[PDB]
Design a protein around this ligand. Structure first.
Ligand SMILES: N[C@H](Cc1ccc(Cl)cc1Cl)C(=O)N1Cc2ccccc2C1
Ligand SMILES: [K+]
Ligand SMILES: [K+]
Ligand SMILES: [Zn+2]
Length: 342
């Protein structure tokens, strides 16, 4: 029951050519490899998503339209979606308790519309596969942006709960995800949104996070978990909003791991290439429970980590815009919503 690591050379080489994240996949992979972490996980080759497999969420019209424009993104969408289905497949066959796909987590993609640079929602696809064996699924999103695509996917049902800790502020994409957003139908109060401001740091973040995941856990009682960990909340990132480091995110990760539920792990945003590699390696270490060394081990992209070549990331000098009073308002409101969840 060792963690499954969704990798093949062809999967990495492909993701390598994605837009604003060039070669990121191989940076992540080879840095992980450079910490000998691969040697501790079951390597599983990602299987390409079939047409029907994607159409489990996206319309045939959009899926066909995606072929046309990518005349390409469609093969991108097909690879990544398949990778996440594959990881979710491994969890259901029970060959692992943890399955990793760092190239997944494209949370903005809608049923028949692309947005937020997401042309296929692999998170949704994986949540659907898991449903084959797991009754209730908890989707937890810690990316910098609201996970509206995954939220929409399931917003009407109570069998899948989404919880999203994101930056919520005017002008900021997607402009949704206030605490007042709780879903609809039988699935009302089964969407959870945690609006957060700029400059927030590891400690305050993990307190807010743990606080909510404890309530949601008792209230929902999941059999599976899907965790998007977009690195675009880490200090130094071009998004320039939160003030987080991997230590804080790993604390949220480790907390969740305690549950020992089947857990599909996904990546996400993160336009700071070396920082994003630093983060998911650290986290991949957290999953393995093996503390890594502060010194980046020489490997193909060693120079990308200069000048100091360490794994730890430093917070920038900026204000924490989150007032303790507003945070408790947000939480108490969330706590109100959870009185309805059973
Ligand atoms: N998380 C979103 C979408 C995303 C982008 C790149 C990668 Cl590698 C993964 C994901 Cl899942 C995001 O980072 N956005 C940045 C941005 C800037 C302006 C408007 C929308 C978005 C979405
Ligand atoms: K989020
Ligand atoms: K829901
Ligand atoms: Zn993002």
């Amino acid at each position: 029951l060792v963690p499954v690591y969704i990798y093949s050379p062809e999967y990495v080489s492909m993701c390598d050519s994605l837009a604003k994240i060039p070669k990121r996949a191989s940076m992540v992979h080879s840095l992980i490899e450079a910490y000998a972490l691969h040697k501790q996980m079951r390597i599983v080759k990602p299987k390409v998503a079939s047409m029907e497999e994607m159409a489990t969420f996206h319309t045939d019209a959009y899926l066909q339209h995606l072929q046309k424009v990518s005349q390409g993104i469609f093969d991108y969408a097909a690879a990544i979606g398949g990778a996440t289905i594959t990881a979710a497949q491994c969890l259901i066959d029970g060959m692992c308790k943890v399955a990793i796909n760092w190239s997944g987590g494209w949370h903005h993609a809608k049923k028949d519309e692309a947005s937020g640079f997401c042309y296929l929602n692999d998170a949704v696809l994986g949540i659907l596969r898991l449903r084959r064996k797991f009754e209730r699924i908890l989707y937890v999103d810690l990316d910098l942006h609201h996970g509206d695509g995954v939220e929409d996917a399931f917003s009407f049902t109570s069998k899948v709960m989404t919880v999203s800790l994101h930056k919520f502020s005017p002008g900021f994409f997607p402009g949704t995800g206030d605490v007042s957003d709780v879903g609809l139908g039988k699935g009302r109060y089964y969407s959870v949104n945690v609006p957060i401001q700029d400059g927030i740091q590891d400690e305050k973040y993990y307190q807010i996070c743990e606080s909510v995941l404890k309530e949601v856990y008792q209230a929902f009682n999941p059999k599976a978990v899907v965790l998007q960990l977009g690195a675009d909340t880490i200090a130094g990132d071009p998004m320039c909003s939160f003030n987080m480091t991997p230590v804080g995110i790993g604390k949220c990760l480790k907390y969740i791991l305690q549950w020992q539920l089947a857990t599909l792990i996904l990546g996400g945003g993160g336009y700071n290439l070396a920082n994003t590699a630093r983060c998911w390696t650290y986290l991949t270490g957290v999953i393995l429970g093996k503390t890594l060394s502060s010194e980046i081990p020489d490997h193909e992209f060693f120079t990308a980590y200069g000048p100091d070549y360490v794994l730890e990331i430093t917070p920038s000098c900026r204000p924490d815009r989150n007032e303790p009073h507003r945070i408790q308002q947000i939480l108490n409101y969330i706590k109100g919503n959870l009185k309805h969840v059973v």
